[PDB]
Each structure stands twice: as C-alpha cells, then as structure tokens.
C-alpha cells in the first residue's frame, strides 16, 4: 500500500519504471487484486536411483545426528507458497539513509581501478554464453506455448538470437516484453530469452571480479581454504556475519549506484543504454506468485520497489560487488579512515596488500582486520549496516560482532576449513555437516548426474573419509562412457591443489581421526556396516555397461 | 661411402636399436639423392634453400689486450657451416673398447645411491616446466607453418599440450614424428614440441645432482670458487684437463648406459619405456645440415651414431653425470681402487668426504687428489681416457696431466678464481678476460641490457670495469621492465648477510688488474670520466636512478 518517498542520488541516472502494460498483459490477469500484502502491490490475479541408495544404511544417524533432513515437505502448497512469499519477500527495503554519497564514491572508485587496469567491459560472447547457461532451466510463463524443453533444448535450437533481439528491441524502447518474473519454490526469474539478454549484457562482470584478491569468483571450493588461511595470516581477526534474507533487502537506491557504475563499465554508448534499462526493470520487479484461497488457487501478479530476484546469472556478480562496496564502506566509516585515502583502501584490498583484507561471495563475506581494528569495528560497525536495513541474522539489531580468531572457526560459503595435509604440504580443506553434503548430492541421465556427484565429491570432499567413500562407490556403480573425467586419477587432483608437487593415492590426506565428530560422521557401528556392506551393495546396482573398481583406493 | 665400425654389446643394457625414422624423414621435403662427401655422418638426400654504446670507448682495448672481438660483426656463410662441421662433428666416435663393464657398475651405483637416498624421479610439472624453458627458443623447421613467435609464445598458447601427447605416442610407437634435428651456427635441436617432452621426461635429473657434492647444479656463480678452494684445501693438487669436442666424442655405448640408468631412476614402467625411445632417437641422430655447392644453397640430411647434440635440454645433465662416471671411473682404475670399494667412493664424493674431489658441470671438470695419488693419475690415466676417445685438447696423447697446487690456477666453467674480501671473510669469486664478460653481456633490448645490468653487478662486482659498467647500465635502463636489487642481495648470497653495505663488497688488488683484467690505464680513465655524460645522452623518456654514485 504505503510506500516511503525515494531516496535523491546526486550523480547517478534514476531507475525511472518502464511502461509495462505490454508486460503485464502477457499474464492473463482475470480478476480484480484482494490486496493482502504489506509492501507488495498487488495487481491483480488470475486461476491457476544410485546415490539415494548408495546412502540408505546411513539414512537414520543422517537424519538424527545430522542435518540430511527427510523433513522435506517434498510439494509446498500454494497456501505455504505465498506464506513464505508475505514473511521474507513482502517487507520494504530501506530507502532513506544517509549514506549513499560515501556508497557512491566508493564504487566510482572501484570502477574507476577497474577501467584503469582491465579496460571496458564487452558483451559476452556465443561461446563464453554457452558455457554459463543452466540448460536446466525453465522457459517461463510467457514462453510455454513455443514448446521447447528447457534452456539448453532452446539454445541448441538457435531461435533465442531473434528473440534476444526482439526483447532488446521493445526494452529500449521503455515498452518491454517478457518484463515480469515467474516464480517457484522463493525463486524469482524471468523467461528464457530474457535470461540469455540480461547474462549476454552483464556477463562480464564476473570477468572482473576474477582479478580481485577479495573475490573467489573462478576458483574452485579446494582453493577456499588457503585464501582464509592467508587472509588471516596477515590479520589475526575475523569478523563473518550473516546477513537474513539479504536479496529481500537491497534497495532502490542501491541498485541505481549499481546501475551507475555498471553503466561506467560499459564500451560504448548504447551498451550503456542497454544496462541501465535492465535496471530500470530490476528496481521495479513484477512477479507471479502462487496463493490458496477457500480451496482456490491463483497466480497473484504483484508489484514490488527494488530488491534482488533468484533466478538472475547477474546476480551473483551484482550482490558480490555491492558486498564489497557497502562492507568496505562501513568498516571505513566505522574506523575512520579518511575519504582520501580510500582509493588506496579498494587497491590494496583488491591486491591482498596491508593488513585488512575481505573475501565476498554473493552474500557471504569474512572482514580481516587486525585486534585493534577488529574490536573498533565489532563495537560500532553494525551502526551503518542498520541504518540500510542490512540487518544482520539471529543476531539483537545492537549486539557487537563476534571476531574470531581461530581460522578454523572461519565460515565462508556454507563451510569451514581445516588443514588437511598433502605429502609435506599442508592445504586447508571445506567442512560442512556431512548431511548436507550427502543431501545436495543425491537431490540437490540419472546414472549420469550422479557419476558428476562422485567426481564432484572426489575432488572436493576427498578429506572426509565417508565422502571419499561415497564418492568411490558412486564411480563404480555408474557406467564408462556417458577437468573431470572417467580417467579422473590423483594427479589431476593434485595439480588443482598443490601444482602437482605431490601425486598418487597416498598422497591424499584426511583429515584428524579425533574431529570425525559433529559435522562429520562418527565411525561407529552403522558406519562400519555401511562399510562393509559398500562392495556387495555396488554389484547389486550395476546393471548393463561397463564398470571399474573404485573402493579398492 | 662411410663405413661404421661394429657396435658394442654391452652386458645387461636394453640396446638402442633404432626407430623407424621414414616419418621424420619424410618431414623434411628431401628432393635429391644424397652427394655423399662426409666421412663419419651418412647423407641420405638434399633439397635447395645500450650495453654496446656504453663500452664503445674500450673498443679499441677490448680488441687488441682482450678477447673481444667485433661482436655481432659477422654471420657464416653456408659453405663455412658444412666446413664447420665436416671438421668438428663428422668424426665417428670410438664405440668399441674394453671398460663397459666397470662404466656401468658406477652409473649402477650411482643410480642405486640416488633411488636409496631421494626416491624415484618424476616427470616435471607444468610450473617446473616453465620455469626452465627458452622462451626466444626456435620452433624448428617442422613447427614454422604454425605461425608461433617463439617458444614462450608457444608455450603460453597451451597448444603444446596435445602436440607433446602427439609426439609421446608417436615415439612409443617406435616411428616418432618430429625427430629429425635442426641446426644452426653447430648447435643442433629437435622442433619445439619434441623438446618441451624431453624437457618433461628427462628435466628431473637436475634435481638429483644439486644435491651431489661433485656437482654445482642449481647454484651461482659466485658460489663455485668456494667450493674449489673447499676441495683445493682437503686435497692439496688438482688436474683440470679439457676434452676437445666432448659432444662429439660420446659413444653409442656410453649413452646405452645413460638410458640404462635413466630407465632405472624412472618412477613407472612407461616412464621407463619413454625414456629408453627417447635414447633409441638419441643414438641415432638424423639433422639437416647447410651447405654450399657451385652457388646453390643446400638443406643436406645427414645419419650419425650416438654422439650428443647441445640443444636438448637434458643434455646437461646427462653430459654431467657422463662426465663424472668416466672420470671416476679413469681415476679408481688408475689410482688401484678395488671394484668393493666403488660404492664408497661414489658415496664420499658425493658427500665431500675422504681425499678425493671432483666438481663437474657438462664437459667442464676438475679432479681434486692428494699429491700421491695426483702424481699416479698424471701419468697414465689418459690410457683410459684415450680408449674412450675422450682426447683432451691441446696436448699430445700420451703426454701427463699437469698438475695444479694453486688453488688460483684452477680453470673451471671457463673461470679462475681469487679471493675477494668481503668485511672480515674472505671469499673465491670468479675472474675471466674481460673481453669475454663484456662481449657476452653485448623493448626486450632495453629489458635484456638491463638484466645483463643486474648479473654482471651480482656476479662480478670485485672486478672493477664490471661494476662499473653494470651500475652505467642500471642508469640507463629504465624502471619497470619485464626482468631494485641492492647490497642487501648481494651480501646475502655471499656471506649469508653477516657483511653489508657497499663498502663491504670487496675488490680485487689493483696489482692484479692487468692479463685478464683491464689495466687502469689512459682509455680505461677516460671511459670513467665521459661515462656519466654517456648514461644522460643515453636515456629515453623513462624514469631512471643514477648508480655510478655508489663508487666514484
Ligand atoms: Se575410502
């Protein structure tokens, strides 16, 4: 209903909203809006086999001990759909704050380093967008009717290059089509061909974030470990906080400095054109929603004032960056370090020098200060990120931040690390409760996707030794011939870890007997029967092709 | 119409029997049927076709008192080329004589001594790889249709990933491709393909002999008068005695028993098999040669047997640990060592224990003995060595080794060495002519000068027209190339940083500054005077420090 006023960027271009009439009415609205949410407006709305196994005998202490979670209402109902959508979606960002001048000057800087050092950013390429399409992906409500299956049957079928255009075509003009998000269970995304637009024209900035020593972006989970471990070398203290339900939180305002600067980064002038665009259709998100009433179910169009949806490929690199800029923001502010030099601070930030550091993943970030900044900062820090709404999770809004320091205790990107040792090398490996691990990795072309599991798992979790068997079992259950390959042997995962200084089986470390405890399975009875059990349970599975034995390493 | 010699048949060593060399052959475009004018080398076809300036003012000494030259003044016409090498390398080495049993013993025990020490050896990474590689190196003549700068550019495409995989199986099919050599004015190579997979297969050797102690592998220059004086003092005389064209001197049967030890150091068995195909090409080299006839250029193919080319970057390390065996071998026979007692001499060698000393780095040795032993090995140990055919250079046959009993007379690796006193210690560093130094430090121009900057300064700065000239190049090269080293560097590769400053990096006497050493005299005090004035009419828009500051 009441929206606040907007916030006055000087400097930057507004998000104006586009005409989406054309959109909107390729919905099929029916009936009048009921109007039931808080910051949402509504507009109205119209009628509506190997891995699993492989686990079994663990399934109990998983699901006791360990969060495997059978508890998977499997279906949401419409009625819980929108449940979920009126708690964490419908809540109004925080636009008003006094803030955004110090915001902006700090992306102007970071895109002002970023065009110094790598040049201006291009549209990705045929080739470099076939390799980031999730050919998984869905068509979209607006899309249906053309029949194709997914994304990658859509891809291969070349159909999307008119449509791309098409889409480009009525955007620019501020009439777009295919404009409003679809939704599942709450994952926002638009059609298919605007997908393809939208990573075609912001694809690049991942290119970016692949330069800075505070982003992971192109290195894979094995290199996590020694970058924490680094980072805290030169520190000695660590602050990582959570922030609840931060794609609901940012504001308008920010995306507009995100729109700024990305429009910085353009090559020429119409590509500039193009993202700022985009962004006047993120700022000014319509979706469809799914509810239940007296037994009846809708597709709810709702219209919402700048957040961040799912089901963008942008979004990772758009919620890295502004994670970066609002982070470094405070901590400057909080510890008062001069506007002047905050060029240097982004630079030496970016190039792992002095004694602060960052690492940012979407939403996920750990702060390295030394112990006087660290107290500095745990004790008046949260001031600012309050003042945006970037509440911190399961947190008292005023409580001082915990700063750790012991790298072990380091969570970053759902996990922690440990030091597992390879020959004489010792590289600090992901841990994570092993539940999770084994629940992404039997629901999270069958025997297929579950033979990438098992080299997934060899490569990434070969420290934990259920992993390591796990993954062992799922090779020699899944057949031959359907970096990663059927010849997967140690000295590829040795090259990826240690540049191939270390080599064979042997070589492999686990990690401490002693901490096989709390997230990590517990060797006991139904362990070691899932043990031995584990080669007369990989025969009873193969059926037909041609297998290998695997437990035998 | 050369005749060859029988081979020999040496007992319990795979035999490099050669490859099926018609697709290598054929890689070369061979349009005529061979002349035939070669003594040793069979013919089997033909087809048709900054740092200078800042010297400048000791040219004229350089040329007339040192060993200078007219540095790249002049190319070699291709009839001196064939000239060069009907000369040099068309000689048949000496394959058939009677100490290839005792030979293979030692590189036996020499390699039984590496595997219980240090384990088997790998093939290198790709980091280790490339930090070892040429990167100006040339493509070869079958890689030229690729269209590559150069070996770096080569290396960076990651192209050569495939084509090295390409070449292996190839080769251990037994008909390789690319294994016919290329030559330039003679240094001899494989395309560049062939040799990053040599490089891969046979560049761990490298890693055994930095930690022999008969071995300077892995370490400066500046390091190696130390170790000379340190064996000089626990034996008290030393024979350093030149092979001529040692290369061209190793037999068929000597690199039998090379790649009989290489298979053994091998971590695998297909490890091994590469490493003994690798020798199977080896000892039975095929390269094209230039030549001159009546005008008309020729590109001539030419088959040998079993001699060692120099561009293979392994042959190094092979021609080291040869080097060492046979000389090990020359002087236990000489000097009466009994057969049981090999193991413990290769042993003490390697760990600079007991009264014998050997320091060996390619063809370039030096045996350190006790007087005694040093006047028995004097005077008959050439038989031994002269039945190899390993002759050693300027000398009759049979005439006795000199014996040297100052440390200052040792020649090795093409240097003498005198003490340097840096603070209170005093150190061995390395002096040449310095009409050598000069000449062989004589875009990536101003990066190359720059480095040559940098070494010189490292490496030379007891002679004083070195450092000079290398702190006039450090003035005039600019800040930021693609190689701010100070003292500090110096002093701890030295002295292990118990000296420092400038003032502690020491000097030869002045008395000494003659021979081999500029004399101080009128050209060398002018030069001093106009160099400054040379550095600021030299400098080009970059930013520079001025170095000469840090003497007069
Ligand atoms: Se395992």
Same mark, same amino acid.
């Given at each position: ?20 009439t ?8 029916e ?6 949410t ?12 190997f ?25 949401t109902?419409p ?13 109004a ?16 800087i ?14 990705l ?21 053309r ?8 891809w ?15 955007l ?11 939704t ?33 972006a ?7 470990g020694?970058?924490?471990?680094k ?29 700024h ?24 998100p ?31 690199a ?5 994670n ?14 001069p ?16 004694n602060?550091?960052l ?7 750990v702060?390295?200060?030394?112990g006087? !900044?660290? %107290?500095?900062? @745990? ?12 509440? +911190?999770? &399961?947190? #008292? ?23 597992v ?28 996707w ?7 798992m ?7 030794? !259920?992993? %390591?068997?796990? @993954? ?9 011939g359907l970096?990663? +390959?059927? &010849?997967? #042997? ?16 042997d ?12 997230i ?34």
């Amino acid at each position: 209903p009441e929206w606040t006023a907007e916030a006055v960027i000087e400097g930057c271009a507004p998000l104006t909203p586009l005409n989406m009439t054309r959109s909107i009415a390729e919905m099929h609205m029916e009936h009048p809006p009921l109007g039931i949410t808080r910051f949402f407006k509504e507009l109205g709305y119209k009628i509506a086999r190997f891995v699993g196994q492989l686990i079994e005998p663990l399934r109990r202490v998983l699901e006791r001990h360990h969060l495997f979670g059978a508890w998977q209402l499997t279906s949401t109902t419409p009625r819980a759909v929108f449940n979920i959508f009126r708690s964490k979606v419908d809540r109004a960002p925080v636009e008003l704050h006094s803030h955004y001048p110090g915001l902006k000057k700090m992306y102007d800087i970071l895109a002002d380093l970023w065009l110094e050092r790598y040049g201006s950013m291009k549209r990705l390429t045929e080739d470099e967008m076939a390799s980031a399409i999730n050919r998984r992906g869905a068509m979209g409500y607006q899309m249906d009717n053309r029949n194709y299956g997914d994304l990658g049957a859509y891809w291969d079928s070349g159909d999307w290059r008119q449509d791309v255009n098409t889409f480009k075509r009525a955007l620019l003009s501020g009439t777009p089509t295919h404009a409003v998000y679809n939704t599942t269970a709450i994952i926002q995304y638009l059609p298919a061909d605007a997908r393809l637009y939208e990573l075609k024209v912001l694809g690049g900035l991942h290119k970016y974030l692949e330069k800075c020593g505070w982003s992971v972006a192109g290195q894979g989970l094995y290199k996590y470990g020694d970058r924490v471990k680094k980072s805290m070398d030169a520190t000695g203290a660590a602050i990582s906080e959570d922030v609840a339900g931060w794609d609901t939180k940012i504001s308008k305002g920010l995306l507009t400095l995100e729109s700024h600067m990305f429009t910085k980064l353009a090559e020429d002038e119409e590509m500039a054109r193009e993202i700022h665009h985009l962004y006047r259709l993120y700022a000014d998100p319509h979706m469809v929603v799914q509810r239940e009433i007296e037994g009846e179910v809708h597709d709810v169009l709702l219209r919402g004032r700048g957040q961040v949806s799912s089901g963008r490929q942008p979004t990772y690199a758009a919620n890295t960056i502004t994670n970066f800029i609002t982070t470094t923001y405070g901590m400057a502010m909080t510890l008062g370090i001069p506007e002047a030099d905050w060029p240097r601070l982004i630079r030496n930030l970016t190039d792992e020098r002095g004694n602060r550091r960052l690492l940012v993943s979407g939403d996920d970030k750990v702060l390295f200060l030394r112990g006087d !900044e660290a %107290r500095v900062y @745990a004790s008046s820090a949260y001031r600012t990120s309050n003042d945006m709404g970037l509440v +911190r999770k &399961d947190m #008292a809004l005023e409580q001082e931040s915990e700063i750790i320091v012991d790298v072990k205790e380091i969570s970053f990107c759902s996990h922690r690390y440990w030091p597992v040792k390879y020959g004489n090398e010792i590289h600090y490996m992901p841990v994570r409760d092993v539940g999770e691990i084994f629940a992404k990795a039997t629901m999270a072309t069958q025997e297929a996707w579950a033979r990438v599991q098992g080299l997934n798992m060899l490569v990434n979790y070969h420290h934990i030794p !259920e992993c %390591r068997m796990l @993954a062992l079992a799922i090779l020699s259950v899944t057949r031959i011939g359907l970096w990663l +390959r059927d &010849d997967l #042997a140690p000295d590829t995962i040795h090259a990826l870890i240690t540049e191939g200084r270390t080599s064979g089986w042997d070589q492999l470390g686990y990690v401490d007997f002693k901490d096989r405890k709390g997230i990590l399975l517990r060797p006991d009875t139904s362990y070691k029967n899932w043990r031995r059990d584990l080669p007369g349970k990989v025969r009873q599975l193969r059926e037909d092709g041609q297998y290998k034995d695997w437990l035998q390493r």
